[PDB]
Structure formats: C-alpha cells, structure tokens
Amino acid sequence: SEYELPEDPRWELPRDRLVLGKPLGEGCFGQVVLAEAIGLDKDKPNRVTKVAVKMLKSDATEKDLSDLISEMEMMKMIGKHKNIINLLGACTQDGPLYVIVEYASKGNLREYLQARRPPGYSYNPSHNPEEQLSSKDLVSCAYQVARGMEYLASKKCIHRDLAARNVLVTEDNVMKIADFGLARDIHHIDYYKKTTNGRLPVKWMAPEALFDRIYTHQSDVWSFGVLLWEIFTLGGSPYPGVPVEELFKLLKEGHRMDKPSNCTNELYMMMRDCWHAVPSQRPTFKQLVEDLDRIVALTSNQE
Numbered sequence: 001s002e003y004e005l006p007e008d009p010r011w012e013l014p015r016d017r018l019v020l021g022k023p024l025g026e027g028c029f030g031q032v033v034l035a036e037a038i039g040l041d042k043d044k045p046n047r048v049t050k051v052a053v054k055m056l057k058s059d060a061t062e063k064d065l066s067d068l069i070s071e072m073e074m075m076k077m078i079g080k081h082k083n084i085i086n087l088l089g090a091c092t093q094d095g096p097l098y099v100i101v102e103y104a105s106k107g108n109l110r111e112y113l114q115a116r117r118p119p120g121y122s123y124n125p126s127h128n129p130e131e132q133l134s135s136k137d138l139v140s141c142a143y144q145v146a147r148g149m150e151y152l153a154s155k156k157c158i159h160r161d162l163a164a165r166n167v168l169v170t171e172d173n174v175m176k177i178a179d180f181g182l183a184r185d186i187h188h189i190d191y192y193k194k195t196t197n198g199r200l201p202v203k204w205m206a207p208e209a210l211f212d213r214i215y216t217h218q219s220d221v222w223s224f225g226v227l228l229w230e231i232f233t234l235g236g237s238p239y240p241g242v243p244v245e246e247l248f249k250l251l252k253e254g255h256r257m258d259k260p261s262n263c264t265n266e267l268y269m270m271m272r273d274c275w276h277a278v279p280s281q282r283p284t285f286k287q288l289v290e291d292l293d294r295i296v297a298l299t300s301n302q303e
C-alpha cells in the first residue's frame, strides 16, 4: 500500500479467485505456495487451475519488492514458451504482491532424475521410486531444455545459472526453465557460497564467467553442457571431489569431466563442444536444438 504497485488489467487476478494452499518446497525460488486459481482463463470462469504463487517474505526490503516487480515485468516481455515457467497472472491490489506462475508438480530435474534411477548410477535416494526413463526420454529432456534456452536466447535473455536444479518438471513431464527473469546482481559474489539447497553454482560457470564475470549466450551453452552431464548421470553432482580452488586450476589447464558411464560418444562430444575453452567455438542453442532433434528421433525407446 505504501508503494505504487503496477496494475496490468490483462494480468491482474482478483484476490478472491486465489485459494492458497501448502508452501511448495524449501524456498529455493522464494516464498512459493501452491494454489488454485478460479477463472484464470476468462472463457472458463468456473474452472480451477493449480498454480504456483510467489510472494515476499516478512523481512522483505524495498529492494526485494522492486526485484519481484521487475521479474514479473521481465516475464511479460520475454513472452510465453512451452519449455519455460510461464507467467499466468498477478495480484497487486488489496494485499501483498502475488506473482502467479505455472505449477510443476514433479520437482526440479535433478530430483526428478534421481528418483528414477534404477536400483543398480549412484543410488536412488527416493523412498517412493518412479519408473525408469528410456534413453529417448533422456535425450528428449535435453531437447526440451535446449528449446527453452533457444527461445530465451532469441529474446536476448541470458540465464547465468542454467542447471538441473533450475529446470522444473510438470505433471505431464514437460521440462520448464525456471528463474530466468532475474536481474543480475550489481555486487561481486562469493565463489564458495551455496544456495539454500546447498548447490555450488560455480561448477556450472564457463571459465570467462568464472575469471572475468563475462556472461553471454555462449556461457549459457557451457552451462548447458554441464546440465547434459547431469541428465546422463541421472542427477549426478559435477566434478565429484574437486574443491573450488582446484576447479579454477583444472579448467584453465583444460580438463573436463569424464563421460558418464551410460552416455553415447556422440552426446559426450556434444558436452565437450559446449565446454570449448573459446566462447566463439561453442555451438549455439539453435544448433543444439537441431542436433538433439535428430538424436531424439534416432534414439531407442526400448532401453
């Protein structure tokens, strides 16, 4: 009420049409709760949709608020795509700011993959394992992420933290890139500081991002290579046993993670190409999409 929150009639949802439910997850993407929205779709005003609702914490500063507004406005400018988390609406009047986005019921991609490990990869940590993925399913996962990044890059959006923990999976097994709308911090950052889930984002950074804080579409392609490695280890942890100060050394001297046990030579070579030392020599997302499209069609669904 103290601030001028922007009301956009095309996106604004009355507060009374949002039935809030349980908090979602452990807060990696903010204070997010599950909800049911009534009549999100103006042609179907009596139908309910499950949605995720982002809000600010109790300790939120004016900086946290401006960031959430900016994230909302950035999602509008980027537009809709099947393979990103899409904006569905917002509540800016008669209460705290709510930003309403698509709900992904199967967790992030790392958790999705780990729960589908065969009991025979590292162990399956889920107490209720889910059915194993085919080789085609895994390549299709990579294809969908590539398609989401190709769309984001076409809108001049650089993700800067592309990783399996930032891909969410819907009930229909659609991959959606998350947390792309975020303004870049104006301060320098700590290379050793984990997120709230304890991830160590330096292991997804291209060397030019590591050493000189240069982020481009080409550095997202490097991260995509790390994500491909995460997919074919079914949620593995990159650079196992390598401390940060080692990692800096190792990348400079030109080594790269070893191929996952269950990964074709062709997909490993795509990983290695994404990890070209020279940014200009990496594939583009346009090329990756085309190549993964072809690989999906040729990859067996039988094992």
Ligand SMILES: */C=C\C(=O)Nc1cccc(Cn2nc(C#Cc3c(F)cc4nc(C)[nH]c4c3F)c(C(N)=O)c2N)c1
Pocket (backbone or CB within 6 Å): 024, 025, 026, 027, 028, 029, 030, 032, 052, 053, 054, 071, 075, 085, 101, 102, 103, 104, 105, 107, 108, 168, 177, 178, 179, 180, 181, 182, 196, 197
């Ligand atoms: C740190 C531990 C932790 O909480 N991990 C974790 C993993 C997977 C899923 C969840 C819970 N969860 N969060 C979301 C979300 C979201 C979301 C927004 F609210 C707003 C966004 N803007 C942009 C550009 N991306 C956004 C985004 F992903 C969801 C969900 N949408 O379904 C779930 N289930 C917690």
